[PDB]
Design a protein around this ligand. Structure first.
Ligand SMILES: [Cl-]
Ligand SMILES: [Mg+2]
Length: 439
DNA sequence: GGGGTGTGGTAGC
DNA sequence: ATCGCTACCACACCCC
């Protein structure tokens, strides 16, 4: 048991946090792409005609946690029992659940308490622990297999278990559904073999957005090939509005109010107008949705194809701790800020950069929100506050950065006992070069 | 035309 | 118990 005023807190929290792991894994995969390809040219140009294979493990954490489960769970059956991955027994997030669990209505992001009530009498929920190092090892096998197949011109990491793979089609070659289907089956079988039993689904298309939609249709343990020429009202009828990439809960609600609760993407595409959509959700996101309903990518999405090395370059660095934050006084808050700055400066030094702009963000208990939230050590319902500072000279000096961070906290006027979360950010990074002569 | 800030949404499981 | 991260885009609203 490690409290937020213990020196070991950041280490322990990050060791247990699957969301920390997801972000750290992704950052590491981006860095590896850059190192792997530093003398390989890997971009897409205006002259290229290409096909997208969007590949994702099926219920990744639950699959791997099951395959590596301890002997206590030896008689667990992945095809017959409902399985979740989580830390706890009550208000603990279900990070991943298998398709048996989903068949009873259990969904990721539910709390264990919630999901247990959906099970009929006699049927027990199997809760597996996280197996973080095994998640990483299976990801290594995944990316190694994709490269070894030598069928892709560009392999872009999306996440620990998800990649966008691009195949350039020369105009002298006649691409067919049969070639694409056999490629999907080769990929699926090789990954199944290479990971000792994990399955992937694949969406295959001539746009990023359609390959993402095709992938959703392919799950679980399957593939789907839907090109722009194959588009149909039946396709668009298959999807909810937040199945579109970049449409979450908040955008979904805006679309339902504006366009009288469209049920499917086919509903939305027959009702919307471009200006009404831009007014509803914003100009750029409205244009993105407009283009996606034609199966087309927007300019922003295509950037990763045209210059992946620039897109995958890290441009900021931060930590967020919004669980376990219970401080009694400002001395302990300040020590925690100092530990956070030390951690961030270690990362900043690892990548040989300085920073010229920093931000402190905090979560403060809402006035009407309960003092102890329903979730043990949760932030509960909170108000967001942030303040940023431009440093004079770009720096990696602890004295400068930690002092300014503590001063930023001071200016936001959050009493320590109302603090429920903190984020420390280096917003602008500057390269360290061989010439550090400056008057 | 250029610049700036704080706030909020989204994605991976 | 329980581990609600984090990079990036985009917006509203301020200034020359
Ligand atoms: Cl999952
Ligand atoms: Mg979505």
């Amino acid at each position: 048991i490690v409290a937020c005023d213990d020196p070991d807190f950041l280490t322990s929290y990050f060791a247990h946090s699957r969301l920390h792991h997801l972000s750290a894994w992704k950052a590491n995969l981006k860095d590896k792409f850059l190192n792997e390809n530093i003398h390989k040219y890997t971009k897409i140009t205006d002259k290229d005609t290409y096909i997208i294979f969007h590949i994702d493990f099926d219920c990744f954490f639950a699959t791997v946690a099951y395959l590596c489960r301890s002997s206590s769970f030896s008689a667990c059956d992945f095809k017959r029992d409902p399985i979740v991955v989580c830390h706890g027994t009550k208000n603990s997030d279900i990070a991943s659940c298998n398709y048996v669990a989903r068949s009873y209505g259990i969904k990721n992001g539910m709390w264990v308490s919630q999901a247990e009530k959906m099970l009929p009498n006699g049927i027990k929920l199997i809760s597996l622990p996280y197996t973080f190092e095994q998640f990483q090892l299976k990801s290594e096998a995944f990316y190694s297999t994709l490269k070894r197949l030598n069928i892709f011109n560009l392999i872009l990491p999306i996440s620990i278990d998800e990649a966008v793979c691009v195949r350039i089609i020369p105009d002298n070659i006649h691409n067919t559904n049969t070639l694409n289907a056999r490629l999907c089956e080769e990929i699926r079988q090789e990954i199944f073999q290479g990971t000792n039993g994990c399955t992937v689904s694949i969406g295959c298309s001539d746009s990023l957005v359609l390959a993402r939609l095709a992938l959703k249709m392919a799950k679980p343990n399957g593939y789907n090939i839907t090109f722009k020429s194959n588009l149909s009202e039946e396709f668009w009828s298959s999807f909810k509005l937040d199945d579109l990439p970049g449409v979450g809960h908040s955008t979904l609600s805006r679309l339902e109010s504006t366009f009288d609760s469209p049920h499917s993407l086919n509903d939305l595409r027959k009702r919307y107008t471009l200006d009404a959509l831009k007014a509803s959700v914003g100009s750029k996101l409205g244009m993105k949705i407009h283009l996606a309903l034609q199966g087309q990518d927007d300019e922003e999405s295509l950037k990763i194809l045209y210059d992946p090395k620039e897109v995958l370059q890290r441009k900021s660095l931060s930590i967020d701790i919004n669980w376990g934050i219970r401080f009694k006084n400002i001395t302990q808050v300040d020590l925690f800020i100092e530990r956070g700055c030390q951690y961030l400066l270690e990362k900043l030094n690892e990548i040989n950069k300085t920073t010229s702009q920093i931000t402190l963000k905090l979560m403060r208990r809402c006035k009407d929100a309960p003092i102890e939230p329903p979730k043990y050590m949760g932030m509960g319902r909170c108000d967001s506050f942030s303040r940023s500072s431009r440093l004079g000279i770009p720096t990696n000096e602890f004295g400068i950065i930690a002092t300014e961070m503590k001063s930023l906290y001071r200016t936001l006027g959050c009493p320590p006992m109302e603090l429920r979360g903190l984020a420390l950010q280096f917003n602008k990074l500057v390269d360290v070069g061989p010439d550090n002569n400056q008057l």
